[PDB]
């Protein structure tokens, strides 16, 4: 018998899945870009009166 812990089973969200390969590595990905740039700076039209 070969020296190994055997097959590995992983559960995610209560469901047990039997994957093909299991590993941890890096991967190129992008990020979210939110350029608000003073969406609502200052704008209002009102008036004043006396009672």
């Amino acid at each position: 018998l070969v020296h190994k812990p055997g097959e590995v089973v992983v559960s995610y969200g209560g469901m047990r899945v039997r994957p093909k390969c299991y590993g941890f590595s890096r991967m190129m990905a992008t990020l979210e870009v939110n350029p608000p740039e003073q969406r609502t700076g200052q704008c209002t039209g009102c008036h004043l009166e006396c009672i």
Binding site: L31, E32, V33, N34, P35
Partner: protein, 51 residues
Amino acid sequence: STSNSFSDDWAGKMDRAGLGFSGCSDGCGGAACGCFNAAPSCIFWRKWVEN
């Protein structure tokens, strides 16, 4: 334990600077944060007193 938060650029190496504390904190990621990686960025800060 590295507390020397001076990369040969701060103005702490003066005779009029005085007493201070070499502190530091992390940053943010994104186009609005100044970098191109959603990860904390190294941002150093130095405070002191004057007369």
